[PDB]
Design an enzyme around this catalytic site. Structure first.
Site, short mmCIF file in Angstrom:
data_model
loop_
_atom_site.label_atom_id
_atom_site.label_comp_id
_atom_site.label_asym_id
_atom_site.label_seq_id
_atom_site.Cartn_x
_atom_site.Cartn_y
_atom_site.Cartn_z
N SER A 36 0.80 -1.26 0.00
CA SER A 36 0.00 0.00 0.00
C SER A 36 0.82 1.29 0.00
O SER A 36 0.23 2.34 -0.22
CB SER A 36 -1.03 0.07 1.14
N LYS A 72 0.31 3.73 -2.77
CA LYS A 72 -0.65 4.87 -2.71
C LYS A 72 0.00 6.28 -2.60
O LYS A 72 -0.61 7.28 -3.00
CB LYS A 72 -1.63 4.64 -1.56
N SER A 122 -6.00 3.59 3.70
CA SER A 122 -5.41 2.69 2.66
C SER A 122 -6.58 2.15 1.86
O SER A 122 -6.77 0.92 1.81
CB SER A 122 -4.59 1.53 3.27
N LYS A 158 3.09 6.30 5.34
CA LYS A 158 2.16 5.34 4.77
C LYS A 158 2.65 3.89 5.05
O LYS A 158 3.83 3.60 4.83
CB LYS A 158 2.10 5.56 3.26
C1 LIG Z 1 -1.95 -2.09 1.56
O1 LIG Z 1 -0.97 -2.82 1.73
C2 LIG Z 1 -3.41 -2.61 1.36
N1 LIG Z 1 -3.47 -4.09 1.23
C3 LIG Z 1 -2.66 -4.68 0.33
O2 LIG Z 1 -1.87 -4.02 -0.36
C4 LIG Z 1 -2.67 -6.23 0.16
C5 LIG Z 1 -1.79 -6.77 -0.79
C6 LIG Z 1 -0.91 -6.04 -1.57
C7 LIG Z 1 0.26 -6.82 -2.16
C8 LIG Z 1 -3.52 -7.11 0.84
C9 LIG Z 1 -3.48 -8.43 0.52
S1 LIG Z 1 -4.62 -9.26 1.45
C10 LIG Z 1 -5.17 -7.85 2.26
N2 LIG Z 1 -6.15 -7.82 3.18
N3 LIG Z 1 -4.46 -6.79 1.78
C11 LIG Z 1 -4.39 -2.02 2.39
N4 LIG Z 1 -3.82 -1.87 3.75
C12 LIG Z 1 -4.53 -2.08 4.89
C13 LIG Z 1 -3.75 -2.15 6.20
O3 LIG Z 1 -3.42 -1.10 6.75
O4 LIG Z 1 -3.03 -3.28 6.43
C14 LIG Z 1 -3.60 -4.12 7.48
O5 LIG Z 1 -2.75 -4.18 8.68
C15 LIG Z 1 -3.06 -3.16 9.54
O6 LIG Z 1 -4.25 -2.98 9.81
C16 LIG Z 1 -1.95 -2.25 10.16
C17 LIG Z 1 -1.07 -1.65 9.05
C18 LIG Z 1 -1.10 -3.13 11.09
C19 LIG Z 1 -2.58 -1.10 10.98
C20 LIG Z 1 -5.93 -2.02 4.95
C21 LIG Z 1 -6.62 -2.79 6.09
O7 LIG Z 1 -6.88 -4.13 5.96
C22 LIG Z 1 -8.33 -4.30 5.91
N5 LIG Z 1 -8.82 -5.29 4.92
O8 LIG Z 1 -8.84 -4.55 7.24
C23 LIG Z 1 -6.78 -1.76 3.70
S2 LIG Z 1 -6.06 -2.80 2.39
#
Ligand SMILES: *C(=O)[C@@H](NC(=O)/C(=C\CC)c1csc(N)n1)[C@@H]1NC(C(=O)OCOC(=O)C(C)(C)C)=C(COC(N)=O)CS1
Length: 446
Positions: free
Chosen positions: A39, A42, A283, A394
């Site tokens: 992410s 972004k 995100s 980020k």
């Molecule tokens: C950013 O990384 C986002 N997710 C991805 O990029 C994923 C894969 C990319 C290669 C991915 C694969 S499976 C999945 N659920 N996402 C967004 N980031 C997040 C988030 O912040 O990460 C979750 O962990 C956390 O909550 C902390 C960073 C520890 C705070 C989002 C939250 O996840 C949601 N689905 O609850 C939105 S997706």
């Protein structure tokens, strides 16, 4: 160097820390090595968007008439021109239809056209894992989006084992659910390796298969709409009927670029600066990816595609931000794609540009602020390092991935940009210990 030892040996760290505007980095560790950004992608999307579209861009959805209105009868087609607005809601369609009626249209002697010509080609970026396509976090960011293209369903086990588990879904979701789910007796040998699966079909059909152990409450499930145009069409058709508007033709998709009709109703999203703040604080993949294909559309004046988006972002970064990303691969806006590949050194150039122009972009304030509401409200490493309120960054998180990109203000009040690309942490103690030390060091030693 000392810090790295805090992590499992299975893990891949690439790290760069540099004072804003400095010619040389304070920390440089495999900074040219390319990594999955997840992410943190972004950041680049937000920057490219501000430069290309500007902070005041709004997504637009319209109802247009092509033809003469005689005696409450449109002689011609109704065109619902979707514009990839990630924030469009069912009630917005209902409102535009209320406005259509109010303008004197009771009847359409013609077709209802669901126009998605803003975009073309697939609604899924290259490199997205197939198995996530039914999950809401990975919902296809189509031209036609309504309530995020996500709906929910309740799965109930059958009272008698061996009987078909059954599905309840709200009337207002135009999807078709089928169950082929066998309810298992408690303690069944089948429960270990029998999966509960979702299988999408054409026209927003979904079939549930496999096994569900007997359970006392329903299982709640949320799925992504696979065919945004059909879904949006069905909602528009429902709203037309409810408002007493009839038509003689059918619901057709319109994919080819065409001249706009007369705009009879419209909805615009919040301005881009507002959406990019949501995107960076939460995100939000859908805002990231609609923005991403919008950039390509805007830069090249073609229906937006993933390839057009990638070329446009590369160009914007080179020509407007003086960052040549070289061998970087940009595959989408959100960082979902496993094709996205970038070195800390490249993302550092992006961060340096942002910091240097931040009075113009108002960018840094949009990133999660450590210790405050957002993705860094509590990140133990940062908290223990004593840097709450000092880091704007980020995250990019996946199983085994702990990326951070952004800025820190140090003890002496200097701003440093940093890119931490850390993966294969399939081995929350070594990570905390690494980040506590690392951020504590940067903050108090600079
Ligand atoms: C950013 O990384 C986002 N997710 C991805 O990029 C994923 C894969 C990319 C290669 C991915 C694969 S499976 C999945 N659920 N996402 C967004 N980031 C997040 C988030 O912040 O990460 C979750 O962990 C956390 O909550 C902390 C960073 C520890 C705070 C989002 C939250 O996840 C949601 N689905 O609850 C939105 S997706």
């Amino acid at each position: 160097d000392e810090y790295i030892t805090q992590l499992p040996a299975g893990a891949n760290l690439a790290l760069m820390v540099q004072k804003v505007g400095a010619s040389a980095p304070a920390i440089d560790y495999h900074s040219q090595q390319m990594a999955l950004p997840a992410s943190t992608q972004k950041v680049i999307t937000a920057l490219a968007a501000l430069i290309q579209l500007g902070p005041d861009f709004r997504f637009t959805t319209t109802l247009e008439t092509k033809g003469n209105v005689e005696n409450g009868v449109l002689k011609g087609d109704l065109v619902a021109r979707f514009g990839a607005d990630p924030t469009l809601k069912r009630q917005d369609i209902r409102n535009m239809v209320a406005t259509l009626k109010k303008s004197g249209v009771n009847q359409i002697d013609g077709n209802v056209l669901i126009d998605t010509s803003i975009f073309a080609s697939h609604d899924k970026a290259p490199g997205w894992p197939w198995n996530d396509m039914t999950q809401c976090f990975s919902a296809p960011p189509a031209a036609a989006i309504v309530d995020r293209n996500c709906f929910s369903v309740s799965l109930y086990s059958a009272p008698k084992p061996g009987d078909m588990a059954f599905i309840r879904v709200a009337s207002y979701y135009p999807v078709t659910m089928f169950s082929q789910v066998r309810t298992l007796p408690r303690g069944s040998a089948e429960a270990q390796y029998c999966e509960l699966d979702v299988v999408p079909g054409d026209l927003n059909r979904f079939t549930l298969t496999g096994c569900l152990p007997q359970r006392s409450e329903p299982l709640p499930l949320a799925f992504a709409v696979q065919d945004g145009a059909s879904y949006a069409g069905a909602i528009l058709k429902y709203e037309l009927k409810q408002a007493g508007i009839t038509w003689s033709g059918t619901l057709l998709r319109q994919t080819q670029v065409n001249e706009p009709g007369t705009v009879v109703a419209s909805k615009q999203s919040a301005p881009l600066h507002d959406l990019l703040k949501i995107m960076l604080k939460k995100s939000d993949n859908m805002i990231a990816d609609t923005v991403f294909r919008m950039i390509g559309h805007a830069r090249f004046n073609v229906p937006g595609t993933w390839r057009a988006g990638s070329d446009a972002v590369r160009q914007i970064l080179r020509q407007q931000a003086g960052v040549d990303i070289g061998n970087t691969i940009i595959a989408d806006g959100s960082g979902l794609s496993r094709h996205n590949l970038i070195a800390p050194a490249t993302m550092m150039q992006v961060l340096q540009y942002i910091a240097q122009h931040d009075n113009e972009l108002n960018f840094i304030s949009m990133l999660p602020l450590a210790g405050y509401d957002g993705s860094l409200q509590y990140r133990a490493g940062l908290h223990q390092a004593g840097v709450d309120g000092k880091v704007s960054a980020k995250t990019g998180s996946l199983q085994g991935v702990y990326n951070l990109a952004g800025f820190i203000t140090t003890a002496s009040g200097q701003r440093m940009a940093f890119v931490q690309y850390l993966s294969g942490y399939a081995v929350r103690i070594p990570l905390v210990r690494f980040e506590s030390r690392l951020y504590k060091d940067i903050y108090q030693n600079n």
